[PDB]
Design an enzyme around this catalytic site. Structure first.
Site, PDB file in Angstrom:
ATOM      1  N   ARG A  89     -19.211 -58.751 -45.962  1.00 35.60           N
ATOM      2  CA  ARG A  89     -19.948 -57.806 -46.480  1.00 35.60           C
ATOM      3  C   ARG A  89     -19.363 -56.938 -47.681  1.00 35.60           C
ATOM      4  NH1 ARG A  89     -23.875 -53.834 -42.791  1.00 35.60           N
ATOM      5  NH2 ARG A  89     -25.103 -55.617 -43.439  1.00 35.60           N
ATOM      6  N   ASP A  92     -19.555 -51.666 -36.353  1.00 35.16           N
ATOM      7  CA  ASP A  92     -19.468 -50.820 -37.558  1.00 35.16           C
ATOM      8  C   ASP A  92     -20.465 -51.172 -38.586  1.00 35.16           C
ATOM      9  OD1 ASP A  92     -17.245 -48.943 -38.747  1.00 35.16           O
ATOM     10  OD2 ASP A  92     -17.120 -50.378 -40.263  1.00 35.16           O
ATOM     11  N   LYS A 149     -13.333 -62.416 -48.412  1.00 29.45           N
ATOM     12  CA  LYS A 149     -12.348 -61.640 -48.193  1.00 29.45           C
ATOM     13  C   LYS A 149     -10.999 -62.274 -48.007  1.00 29.45           C
ATOM     14  CE  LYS A 149     -15.212 -57.597 -46.816  1.00 29.45           C
ATOM     15  NZ  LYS A 149     -15.971 -56.968 -45.755  1.00 29.45           N
ATOM     16  N   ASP A 178     -15.014 -60.594 -42.066  1.00 27.34           N
ATOM     17  CA  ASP A 178     -16.418 -60.477 -42.208  1.00 27.34           C
ATOM     18  C   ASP A 178     -16.761 -60.740 -43.835  1.00 27.34           C
ATOM     19  OD1 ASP A 178     -15.851 -57.805 -43.148  1.00 27.34           O
ATOM     20  OD2 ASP A 178     -17.796 -57.190 -42.898  1.00 27.34           O
ATOM     21  N   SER A 227     -12.683 -50.592 -42.531  1.00 30.67           N
ATOM     22  CA  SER A 227     -13.542 -49.473 -41.963  1.00 30.67           C
ATOM     23  C   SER A 227     -13.623 -49.845 -40.618  1.00 30.67           C
ATOM     24  CB  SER A 227     -14.834 -49.349 -42.738  1.00 30.67           C
ATOM     25  OG  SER A 227     -15.617 -50.423 -42.232  1.00 30.67           O
ATOM     26  N   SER A 233     -19.584 -53.187 -41.865  1.00 33.08           N
ATOM     27  CA  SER A 233     -18.928 -54.664 -42.097  1.00 33.08           C
ATOM     28  C   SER A 233     -20.181 -55.577 -41.141  1.00 33.08           C
ATOM     29  CB  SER A 233     -17.776 -54.669 -40.753  1.00 33.08           C
ATOM     30  OG  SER A 233     -16.760 -53.570 -41.238  1.00 33.08           O
TER      31      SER A 233
END
Lengths: 234, 229, 210, 213, 225, 213, 231, 206, 195
Positions: C19, C166, C33, C17, C129, C169
């Site tokens: 974020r 989540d 990422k 993702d 997470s 995310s």
């Protein structure tokens, strides 16, 4: 011409003197590549009561990589230990086995630091290294006291330099299954040494080491195999 | 003028300091080791100090040992030899400290030969003036004897002599194969060679490893040597 | 964060993702990422952002130096060994849970390196997470053998599940397909007033022309 | 025991630098040519493998190297150049500029001219590269001085080859024309015994490509 | 020669490098120091090419601290580094004792530093001789002359540099105790002018008082009768 | 966790589970690591410590094996044969185990791993050693067990053991031991990996089974 | 016996390596510096190696150290570049310490102290380069400082170093004046560079010329000298 | 809490051929006392690079001095203006080199990426150099939440210099009016390729 | 407990500080000289906090500045002095922090009459008015109210007198004895004020 520094001619005579020292030992060693294998054959004699089985020039740097040093014996063993330390350091840092090429690069860098520095003596040591790379092909890398590495299809250390190149060229041109390839490479190495030395060789005074894809591990063929090959050649 | 340093090759491609060390060792006291049917025997003739009559009887003992089952003897300077022997003891102690097992003989030979060789490289250190016999015996492996030359070499023998008159001792001992001779029957022949090559009692050192010492280092007793003399 | 990896037929697919939150507040809504280590080796990171970024840069440059020296294809095991040895030396104070993936002479290889310096060869991995949601979708839908497209869809579904389930995310979905011959990177793979003049008062003004 | 082996002569000369210059003058020839849209560097027993003996090497994606002199000195300097380029890339996050690498390597080469217990490097290097400030060709001597060139020659018979290239070289040339001029100069000084490297990332031309040219 | 003995004993018994440093001092320019009741006068030769060299940049009379000044003869770069060391030690003493460094202490320190440099390994002797002038703990003024050999000594008046013997003789046959500032300045001028040519630009002279080391203007130096 | 090593007639069998960590982080983990062809080792405790000392010991074993070589000529399961038929140069199990003990003891302030070394050599035949938490070695001539799941099978293994077990019954015993430990312990689970070490050949078995009663 | 003993006195109280370095600098290319009422002028000579050089961007004599200090080199180039790097390091170190641009004299003192340290400590050869360091500071004004391998420096209004520096100094003595414009200073620099080479018409292809004015440094492009040559 | 000692905040924004960087003017003391109301938190590196440092004032000054030192060394060596992305990565590396003894500074880098096409370049970091390269705006400080809300609300893409000034100034003043430890005047600094505009906003001093 | 006050201007810069040498629950002295550290060249570094840290840091800075001014033979600028002091105080912040609160003051021909406020954390900025200690809570707004840009020396002294009366009246440490510095007209002057 005492220090490893430049002369008015521009050459460094200490390297030439070290090469003379290596040639003075009168030890001959022939390395030959093959289709999927590499052979080193060496003369196995000093540079009545002496233990003649103990005399060797070949060494096992690793299970895969092996070598053959010629020159001063203490310098030869010290270079062997340096090669083993370099391979061990590579395996520790990187977690996979070094190949012959990179090991020769690093060893010649270690030779060059002695070459440039006046306070360090040069090692009177030449050496062949063989192994199998990750593409399943052989390697044959040769270095000298000058700190210069080169890959060869076949090479000789000893007195008969730029004379054994002729017979090696003839044999490789004449030759140009894994079992048949290994057999032919070993026969070519033994015949090359026999033609270079120009006298009949006894199996109990030569040492032949083989690396191949069939058996990745560096190993030395027993005296019975060498006797069989010598009978076959004659 | 190429021989005033160990860190320089002459135009002939050789180190003359090593050859001068060879000359120094060759004209020194005599030492020999021999591998018999069920043991090894080591002898040392300290005949250069025969003129000195004030020495305490049987105290200059050139024979030393490592781990109670390796003999180490030398020909050369005493202090440099003690340095080499102390390094050999330290290496054996370090090997036991790491691995809980006595060091093999050939690994110790390689390590100490590397230690000797390290001094022949740099231009600010004196190379070792000593040639070292290091030997051991086993029930199954029989005797293994190594001679380490001052040049860093190390060669395995079935019998070795160094020091003065080494050619005489070599040609005399190269007459009978001792692999079918008991070690007790070899002391007589070694004494005969010492005669050929009064002061025989006190200027000689002896050591042995066979069954009767339980395959461990020992000096031959006076009561064993005297009938053999 | 939801970083994810899996291994397909002669390939490794990574996904993540986009974020980056400084606590409850989202700082960057389209962060990146998936990090390039080599042409045949890629990775994704979870944990402390600075340690991740600088460890990945250090690993990439060390791998490039090794590639120049040895002059052979870089290995996944080499990156794993360097990463684990670096991570243990700080004893878990380098908070970097990194999913490594690549292809080399030993085939495809995916590893999950944990911040204390332990690795594990795996068929698929998820970290961050939102790791548990992606792990659930992966274990539900992963099979023994699949293609590039099936693995791409599975990675996209897992990252979308981590996005929706989540709060740490969110954003778009990026993936990277690492094959022996070359890599192929998609950054947006999924992607699920004017004030008057002179309204603001001033105390001083000055203009200098460069 | 740190005392400088290189020492000023009574005639104000560091004669070890002159002797290293003689050594690189005795070595095989090397040259480099810079075009408007490229830059090339080129150089001149039947058992040695041609693959393992490449004088032309790569430092970075847009920086290549070749040398004339000793091989081992070149290998250690190449390792150092690669390390310095890698450390610049790790620090500033971009590929190193040619001039900065040349300055760093020149400083390192000059250090051994003065450090006690060592002698100067017995080679002369040629950096080729491309960056935002255009194409770059740089020659580094044993002395440690870096020279910015349009085209140059280094090794044996370099004066005659420089004269030939000077009468042949033009600023506005192409990679085809530059490679042709380089091959002409090399065959004048002298396919199997030619190596060429062109810099778009740096490239090595195979024997087939050199034969075609 | 990182750690090697440059200074060693000769077969006779001398240290040759110290003698060579003395020769280097003998090449240096001439400097002169004269004492009075509570003030000193230091005058040193100047050598500037006219119309091209900056007169102010060369500075052989140097202020060390609040109450010490120096005038050297020998190698200039050696003098600069020694003077920087001396200033550093002056401030170090004033930090470590909370009083200004007296002239005797700092003269002893400079002599000790020179002795150390004539004795340690891998170090060349200082090719400079100094005439420090200053005030003591008991407010008494004095001048200390220090050789390259590391030997120091206090003087009523003294000269260093090229042709130092002639100026020393002239100071011997013309010095008197407790003379006025004008007389001291004139004596220093006519003493240092015995070896350097009669001109106003070939000298710089300064007067040390408890308050500060004042420099004599070129106009006042001119009109010396 | 559950790591077991049991000696039987002409052999030694090591065994382990696969589960790693309340949330199962991994479920296919090779806890039995190959130090050398004649010597394996089971890991317990923190995974990072175990992996690092095990790879350090692999490095040390490579160095030892290189130095042990003499000069001159002399003389879903998977199976391997030793390259060293006569054990001319393979290091002894006790040497590797003791250097591991020294490694763990020297850094026992933070290292928290426990190991079971298992192997074969010509001197001591088959061998088992247990390196404990603080770095204390004990030779277990009958069997060694460690891990959080081993506590549930101490009496079971102690009751079922015999001196000279056949290969089949030893395999059944060790398999049932690891199965019972997995059944009782939450920290251990997954597939069972067994390594059988003999004079000549090594076997590596993988088993998938559960407990029913 | 391999030690040459570089760092020892001679019987005449001399350091032989230092004088060898000076007479090596005398064989280098010519460099000139002077000060005018508006700025400090520096100029140099280029040793023609070939026309195949990238002269477009080639200043092998004059270098920038900081926006208020620049230098002109005479000696070995490889020895000069490391000292220029050290000068830049010390300038930025002073700015980092005191939050203020350094004076010129302090930087000259620091580099000359490094030269003295090489001529006194250790067993290493000296740096065989001389600098004409020009600069501006508010404490003093426009300054020009000449240095030596010995670590001995001196301030100047106008001076020369390199080959035939006696003739250049004679021309500067004849022609230089305390009040001079920038154009007058450039023309005098051209005249001195011409008379040093015994040529009345200077060659623009082998003249480097730069200046500093209160701060801005101008490096004259190869076309810019041609306007000054005709005038 | 170390950031709470002095307070402070920095903001950066981009437009069409123009960027802007804005900050407050206060040196705090013990989280409540205002000892200076001109403590500028924006520094000029070169013509096309500016940095906005927020956090602990001593660390702000040391980091500015270190960055000035390294940028001046880079420029005098290379003899060219340092690229904005290169300075960004250099700042990130400098921040990470002090990983375990950090400078408590949350910087932003605002500049023009040249090519000549003057593109905006904005990026933001934390105390250990975590990259936050953002295309529209960048925020750091103790007033980060209010600034993020204001910028997410009022930002308009591709604004000229005047509209960019009004937007960034309104965002900064709105964010600062609801903060105790940041305010006491505001600097706004609008960069264009041809000129630069410095303005002091008329703000609340309380 | 150690009060420091400083006030800038166009024709003056004034400093003031309590003369209390304190240990435990007693005053060692009412004529403490451990606070002002006047430097050669129209410069002053007024410190507060611990007596030992005051002495060590003040003497370190003063001897280093004098070393500079004698090595280079020039007066150091006040901006350079202030930033040198800040850098030196910052260097010890993480290693062994001096708990000293700094007011730098001085005169330059370049930058006029300068004053710099700085704290034990080494956070520095120039100011027209500054103070240190808990007394800074009580003598800050008085400086804000009565300060204007074109003050004379007497008006500034009156402002300082009002600050001293405030410190007597409201601050629990009823400080009555103060020592001043007045940098004006290219001269430094000292005064002592009671109540």
């Amino acid at each position: 011409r005492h220090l490893t520094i430049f002369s008015p001619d521009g050459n460094l005579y200490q390297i030439e003197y070290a090469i003379k020292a290596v040639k003075n030992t009168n030890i001959t060693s022939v390395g030959v590549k093959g289709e999927n294998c590499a052979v080193i054959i060496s003369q196995k004699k000093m540079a009545k009561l002496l233990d003649y089985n103990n005399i060797t020039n070949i060494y096992n740097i690793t299970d895969e990589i092996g070598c053959s040093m010629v020159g001063m014996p203490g310098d030869c063993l010290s270079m062997v230990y340096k090669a083993r330390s370099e391979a061990s350091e590579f395996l520790y840092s990187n977690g996979y086995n070094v190949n012959a090429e990179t090991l020769c690069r690093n060893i010649c860098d270690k030779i060059q630091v002695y070459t440039q520095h006046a306070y360090m003596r040069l090692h009177a040591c030449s050496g062949m290294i063989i192994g199998i790379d990750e593409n399943n092909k052989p390697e044959l890398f040769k270095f000298d006291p000058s700190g210069f590495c080169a890959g060869y299809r076949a090479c000789v250390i000893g007195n008969k330099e730029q004379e054994s190149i002729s017979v090696l060229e003839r044999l490789l041109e004449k030759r140009k299954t894994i079992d048949e390839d290994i057999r032919n490479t070993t026969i070519l190495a033994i015949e090359a040494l026999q033609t270079i030395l120009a006298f009949d060789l006894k199996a109990s005074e030569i040492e032949v080491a083989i690396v191949s894809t069939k058996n990745r591990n560096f190993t030395q063929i027993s005296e019975k195999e060498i006797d069989n090959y010598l009978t076959y050649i004659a | 003028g190429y021989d005033l340093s160990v860190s320089t090759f002459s135009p002939d491609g050789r180190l003359y300091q090593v050859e001068y060390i060879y000359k120094s060792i060759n004209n020194n006291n005599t030492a020999l080791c021999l591998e018999c049917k069920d043991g090894i025997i080591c002898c040392c003739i300290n005949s250069n100090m025969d003129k000195n009559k004030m020495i305490k009887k049987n105290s200059y003992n050139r024979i030393y040992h490592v781990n109670n089952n390796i003999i180490i003897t030398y020909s050369g300077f005493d202090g440099d030899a003690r340095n080499i022997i102390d390094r050999a003891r330290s290496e054996a102690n370090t090997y036991y400290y790491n691995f809980h097992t006595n060091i093999p003989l050939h690994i110790l030979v390689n390590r100490i030969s590397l230690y000797i060789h390290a001094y022949t490289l740099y231009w600010h250190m004196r190379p070792f003036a000593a040639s070292i016999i290091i030997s051991s015996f086993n029930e199954k492996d029989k005797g293994d004897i190594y001679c380490i030359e001052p040049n860093g070499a190390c060669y395995k023998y079935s019998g070795i002599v160094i020091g003065k008159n080494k050619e005489m001792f070599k040609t005399e001992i190269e007459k009978k194969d001792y692999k079918d001779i008991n070690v007790r029957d070899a002391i007589e022949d070694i004494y005969k060679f010492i005669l050929t090559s009064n002061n025989l009692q006190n200027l000689v050192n002896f050591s042995w490893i066979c069954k009767e010492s339980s395959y461990e280092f020992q000096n031959i007793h006076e009561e064993i040597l005297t009938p053999a003399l | 964060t939801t970083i994810c990896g899996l291994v397909c037929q002669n390939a490794v697919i990574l996904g993540a993702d986009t974020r980056a939150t400084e606590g409850p507040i989202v700082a960057d809504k389209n962060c990146s990422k998936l990090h390039y280590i080599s042409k045949n080796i890629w990775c994704a990171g979870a944990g402390v952002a600075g340690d991740l970024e600088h460890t990945t840069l250090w690993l990439q440059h060390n791998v490039e130096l090794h590639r120049l020296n040895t002059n052979t294809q870089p290995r996944v095991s080499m990156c794993v060994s360097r990463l684990t040895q670096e991570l243990f030396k700080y004893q878990g104070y380098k908070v970097c849970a990194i999913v490594l993936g690549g292809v080399d002479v030993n085939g495809p290889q995916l590893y999950g390196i944990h911040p204390h310096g332990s690795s594990c060869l795996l068929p698929f991995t998820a970290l961050g997470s939102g790791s548990l949601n992606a792990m659930a979708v992966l274990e539900a839908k992963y099979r023994d053998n699949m293609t590039i497209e099936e693995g791409k869809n599975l990675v996209c579904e897992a990252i979308c599940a981590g996005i929706f389930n989540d709060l740490g995310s969110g954003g778009n979905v990026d993936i990277c397909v690492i094959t022996k011959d070359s890599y192929q990177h998609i950054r947006p793979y999924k992607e699920p007033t004017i004030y008057p003049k002179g309204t603001t008062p001033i105390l001083s003004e000055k203009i200098e022309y460069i | 025991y740190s005392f400088s082996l290189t020492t000023f002569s009574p005639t104000g000369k560091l004669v070890q630098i002159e002797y290293a210059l003689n050594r690189v003058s005795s070595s095989s020839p090397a040259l480099g040519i810079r075009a408007k849209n490229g830059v090339i560097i080129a150089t001149e027993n039947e058992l040695i493998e041609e693959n393992s003996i490449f004088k032309i090497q790569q430092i970075s994606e847009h920086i290549g190297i070749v040398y004339a002199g000793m091989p081992g000195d070149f290998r250690v300097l190449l390792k150092r150049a690669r390390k310095e380029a890698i450390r610049y890339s790790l620090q500033y996050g971009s590929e190193i500029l040619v001039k900065e690498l040349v300055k760093i390597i020149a400083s390192i080469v000059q250090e051994f001219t003065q450090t006690g217990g060592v002698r100067p490097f017995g080679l002369s290097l040629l950096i080729c590269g491309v960056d935002v400030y255009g194409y770059h060709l740089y020659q580094i001597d044993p002395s440690g001085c870096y020279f910015n060139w349009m085209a140059t020659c280094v090794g044996k018979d370099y004066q005659n080859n420089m004269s030939f290239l000077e009468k042949r070289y033009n600023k506005d040339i192409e990679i085809e024309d530059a490679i042709h001029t380089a091959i002409l100069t090399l065959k004048e000084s002298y396919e199997k015994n030619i190596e060429i490297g062109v810099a778009k990332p740096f490239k090595i031309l195979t024997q087939n490509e050199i034969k075609d040219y | 020669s990182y750690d090697r003995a440059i200074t060693v004993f000769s077969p006779d018994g001398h240290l040759l490098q110290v003698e060579h440093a003395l020769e280097a001092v003998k090449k240096g320019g001439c400097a002169v120091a004269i004492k009075s009741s509570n003030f000193a006068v230091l005058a040193v030769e100047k050598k500037n090419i006219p119309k091209l060299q900056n007169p102010k940049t060369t500075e052989k009379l140097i202020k060390l601290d609040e109450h010490n000044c120096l005038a050297f003869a020998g190698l200039n770069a050696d003098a600069r580094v020694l003077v920087n060391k001396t200033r550093l030690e002056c401030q170090r003493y004033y930090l470590n004792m909370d009083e200004p460094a007296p002239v005797d202490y700092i003269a002893k320190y400079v002599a000790k530093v020179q002795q150390k440099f004539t004795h340690r390994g891998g170090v060349r002797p200082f090719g400079i001789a100094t005439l420090i002038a200053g005030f003591k703990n008991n407010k008494e003024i004095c001048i200390y002359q220090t050789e390259p050999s590391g030997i120091y000594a206090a003087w009523k008046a003294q000269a260093i540099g090229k042709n130092a013997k002639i100026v020393q003789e002239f100071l011997e046959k013309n010095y008197q105790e407790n003379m006025e500032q004008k007389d001291c300045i004139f004596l220093a001028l006519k003493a240092i002018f015995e070896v350097v040519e009669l001109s106003s630009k070939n000298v710089e002279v300064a007067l040390l008082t408890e308050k500060d080391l004042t420099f004599i203007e070129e106009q006042e130096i001119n009109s010396m009768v | 966790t559950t790591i077991i090593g049991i000696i039987y007639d002409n052999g030694v069998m090591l065994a382990c589970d696969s589960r790693t960590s309340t949330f199962i982080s991994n479920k296919c983990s090779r806890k039995i690591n190959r130090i050398n062809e004649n010597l394996y080792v089971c890991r317990s405790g923190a995974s990072a410590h175990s992996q690092k000392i095990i790879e350090i010991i692999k490095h040390y074993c490579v160095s030892m094996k290189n130095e042990n070589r003499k000069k001159g000529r002399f003389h879903t399961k998977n199976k391997y044969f030793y390259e060293d038929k006569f054990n001319d140069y393979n290091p002894l199990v006790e040497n590797v185990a003791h250097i591991t003990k020294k490694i763990i003891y020297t850094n026992n302030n933070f290292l928290s791993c426990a190991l079971i070394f298992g192997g074969y050599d010509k001197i001591k035949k088959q061998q088992l050693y247990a390196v404990n938490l603080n770095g204390s070695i004990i030779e277990k001539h009958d069997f060694a067990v460690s891990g959080s799941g081993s506590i549930y099978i101490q009496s079971y293994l102690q009751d079922k053991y015999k001196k000279f077990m056949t290969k089949k019954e030893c395999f059944n015993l060790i398999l049932n031991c690891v199965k019972y430990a997995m059944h009782n312990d939450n920290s251990s689970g997954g597939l069972i990996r067994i390594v059988n070490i003999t004079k000549s050949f090594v076997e590596e078995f993988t088993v998938v089974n559960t407990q029913m009663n | 016996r391999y030690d040459s003993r570089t760092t020892t006195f001679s019987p005449e109280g001399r350091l032989y390596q230092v004088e060898y370095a000076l007479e090596a600098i005398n064989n280098a290319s010519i460099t000139i510096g002077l000060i005018t009422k508006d700025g400090v002028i520096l100029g140099a000579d280029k040793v023609f190696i070939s026309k195949l050089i990238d002269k477009a961007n080639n200043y092998e004599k004059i270098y920038k150290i900081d926006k208020h200090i620049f230098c002109g080199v005479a000696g070995l180039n490889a020895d000069a570049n490391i000292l220029i790097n050290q000068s830049r390091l010390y300038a930025q170190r002073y700015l980092y310490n005191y939050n203020e641009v350094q004076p010129v004299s302090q930087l000259v003192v620091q580099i000359c102290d490094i030269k003295q340290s090489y001529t006194q400590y250790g067993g290493l050869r000296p740096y065989g380069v001389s600098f004409l360091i020009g600069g501006y500071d508010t404490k003093d004004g426009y300054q020009l400082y000449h240095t030596d391998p010995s670590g001995n420096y001196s301030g100047w209004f106008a001076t020369a170093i390199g080959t035939n520096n006696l003739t250049a100094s004679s021309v500067l003595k004849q022609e230089w004046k305390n009040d001079m414009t920038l154009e007058e200073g450039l023309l005098l620099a051209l005249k001195t560079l011409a008379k040093s080479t015994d040529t009345e018409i200077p060659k623009s292809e082998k003249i480097e010329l730069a200046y500093l004015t209160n701060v801005y440094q101008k490096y004259l492009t190869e076309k810019e000298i041609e306007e000054l040559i005709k005038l | 809490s170390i950031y709470n000692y002095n307070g402070g905040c920095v903001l950066g924004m981009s437009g069409s051929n123009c960027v802007a960087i804005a900050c407050d003017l206060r040196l705090g003391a013990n989280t409540f006392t205002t000892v200076s109301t001109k403590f500028s938190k924006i520094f000029k590196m070169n013509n096309n690079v500016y940095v906005g440092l927020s956090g602990l004032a001593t660390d702000i000054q040391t980091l500015y001095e270190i960055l000035r030192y390294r940028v001046n060394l880079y420029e005098v060596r290379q003899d060219a203006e340092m690229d904005v992305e290169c300075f960004a990565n250099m700042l990130s590396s400098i921040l990470y080199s002090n990983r375990f003894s950090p400078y408590f500074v949350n910087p932003i880098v605002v500049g023009f990426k040249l090519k000549v096409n003057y593109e905006p370049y904005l990026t933001a970091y934390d105390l250990i150099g975590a990259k936050c390269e953002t295309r529209d705006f960048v925020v750091n400080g103790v007033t980060s939440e209010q600034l993020f809300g204001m910028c997410e609300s009022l930002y308009v893409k591709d604004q000229d210099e005047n509209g960019l000034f009004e937007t960034i100034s309104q965002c900064l003043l709105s964010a600062l009016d609801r903060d105790c430890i940041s305010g006491w005047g505001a600097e706004v600094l609008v960069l264009t390729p041809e000129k630069i505009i410095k303005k002091k906003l008329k703000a609340r001093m309380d | 407990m150690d009060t420091l006050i400083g006030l800038r201007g166009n024709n003056f810069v004034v400093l003031a500080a309590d003369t209390y040498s304190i240990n435990s629950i007693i005053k060692l002295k009412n004529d403490d000289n451990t606070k002002f550290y006047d430097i050669h060249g129209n410069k002053c570094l007024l410190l507060g906090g611990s007596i030992g840290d005051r002495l060590q840091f003040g003497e370190f800075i003063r001897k280093n500045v004098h070393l500079y001014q004698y090595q280079n033979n020039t007066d150091m600028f006040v901006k350079s002095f202030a930033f040198f002091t800040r850098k030196n105080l910052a260097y010890y912040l993480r290693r062994n922090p001096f708990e000293v609160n700094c007011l730098i003051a001085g005169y330059d021909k370049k930058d006029g009459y300068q004053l710099y406020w700085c704290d034990y954390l080494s956070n520095m900025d120039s100011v027209n008015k500054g103070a240190h200690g808990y007394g800074a809570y009580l003598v800050s707004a008085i400086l804000d109210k009565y300060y204007h840009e074109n003050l004379t020396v007497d008006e500034a002294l009156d402002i300082f007198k009002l600050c001293f009366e405030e410190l007597k009246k409201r601050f629990l440490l009823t400080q009555i004895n103060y020592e001043l510095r007045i940098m004006y007209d290219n001269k430094v002057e000292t005064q002592y004020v009671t109540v």
